[PDB]
From a paper:
Human 3-phosphoglycerate dehydrogenase (PHGDH) is responsible for the NAD+-dependent conversion of 3-phosphoglycerate (3-PG) to phosphohydroxypyruvate (PHP), which is the first step in the de novo serine synthesis pathway. Thus, PHGDH activity diverts glycolytic flux into biomass production. Limited proteolysis with thermolysin revealed a stable fragment of PHGDH consisting of the core of the catalytic domain containing the cofactor-binding site, and this was shown to crystallise readily. Thus PHGDH-93 provides a valuable tool to investigate binders to the cofactor-binding site.
PHGDH-93 was then successfully crystallised with an empty, accessible cofactor-binding pocket. Soaking of all 15 fragments into PHGDH-93 crystals was performed overnight at RT using a fragment concentration of 80 mM in 20 % DMSO. Difference electron density corresponding to seven fragments (3, 5, 9, 10, 14-16, 47 % of tested compounds) was clearly visible. All of the fragments for which crystallographic data were obtained bound to the adenine-pocket suggesting this pocket to be a preferential site for fragment binding. Analysis of the fragments’ binding modes showed that four of the fragments (5, 14, 15 and 16) were coordinated by hydrogen and/or halogen bonds, whereas the other three fragments (3, 9 and 10) appeared to be stabilised only by apolar contacts. Of the four compounds forming specific interactions with the protein, fragments 5 (3-chloro-4-fluorobenzamide), 14 (5-fluoro-2-methylbenzoic acid) and 15 (N-(3-chloro-4-methoxyphenyl)acetamide) constitute substituted benzene rings. Fragment 14 was substantially less potent (Kd = 26 ± 31 mM) compared to the two structurally similar fragments 5 and 15 (5, Kd = 1.6 ± 0.2 mM and 15, Kd = 2.8 ± 1.6 mM). However, fragment 14 still formed a hydrogen bond with the side-chain of Asp174 and a water molecule present in the binding pocket.
Author numbering:
A (entry chain B), B (entry chain A): 100 to 294
Write the structure that this text describes.
Amino acid sequence: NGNSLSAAELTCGMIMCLARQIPQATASMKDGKWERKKFMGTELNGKTLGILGLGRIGREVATRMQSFGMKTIGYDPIISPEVSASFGVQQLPLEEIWPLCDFITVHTPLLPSTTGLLNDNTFAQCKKGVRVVNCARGGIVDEGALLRALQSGQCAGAALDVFTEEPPRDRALVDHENVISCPHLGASTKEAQSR
Amino acid sequence: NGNSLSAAELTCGMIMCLARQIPQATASMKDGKWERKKFMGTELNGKTLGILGLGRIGREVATRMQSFGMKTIGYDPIISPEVSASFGVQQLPLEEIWPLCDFITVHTPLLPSTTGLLNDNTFAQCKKGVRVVNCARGGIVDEGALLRALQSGQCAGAALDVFTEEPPRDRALVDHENVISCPHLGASTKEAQSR
Ligand SMILES: Cc1ccc(F)cc1C(=O)O
Ligand SMILES: Cc1ccc(F)cc1C(=O)O
């Protein structure tokens, strides 16, 4: 609420980091390397962003990424489609969303219906090379399914602010070259902190 | 032109990386650490972005960063103030720009007038803790001045895609904890490459 914008901002940063591998490029440069072919990236403009969860945060993400020319679709069980259309988000059933997306970001509570919202079954319906962001709650993206999708290249990259366990005790996800991460910084700004 | 949007998108990513230290946070996570106090960040919304150079790329950057609620000011010796106002950028003389900016981004050619555009003189007029982005041409930002401003905290962070010498032979800048960098990736997307 108070911290809606901090969260939305971090999310949009993670989307741009996934498109251009800025974290990985900075580590490469700090190691004295100059690796230009390795960090060939993609443009956001024209790409499709799926926003799962269309409350305050998800709406803030949408309007920000619309300015980059991304197409914004999404799903929220409770938000009427008229409301989501007011902020430029086409609502579709989940089953319609998966194959359309270049990027998927989650802005849901952690409930049994959203634990593993992204899992092996939903990864398999995604377009090959989908990129995912979770700056919401640890466990929305099933971490084992995610590593499997990174290993096969079904998922081309992920950005995680949150983990099923914090700090994350299992490191294969975090240490993967196509994964960028933060220690649950979503609400960690001076402005969110100080009202 | 062809690569205007690739450049503009990398620039907006660098600004978001500066605000939230995403590259530094990922490195901290990849080193097995969980450092939440260290990576306190700031919100973009309400902050001022100075844009030096108001051609295609600078204009693209402006409209994208306007969606985050940043105030966009800037300077371009050619563009009239009524025109730049038409894409939401308030023109002011440089001397006016320096004290007002939370972030400064450069989108100029490399000419005698722009080499060391940011230097010890211009850093001293900036607000304490300014963050700077160069994704245009190496040398617009004087590198020795930049390191001095990072060491003193006059500059709170910088993001560099380009260097006076490439690859950069001198590492005190690149290795600084508040500096994020890439190996001149500005035009490096599949879409810019392939017309
Ligand atoms: C409950 C729920 C299920 C599926 C989904 F995609 C989103 C939500 C939400 O809580 O916003
Ligand atoms: C020539 C020039 C000088 C100062 C500056 F801020 C911008 C430019 C530009 O070429 O856009």
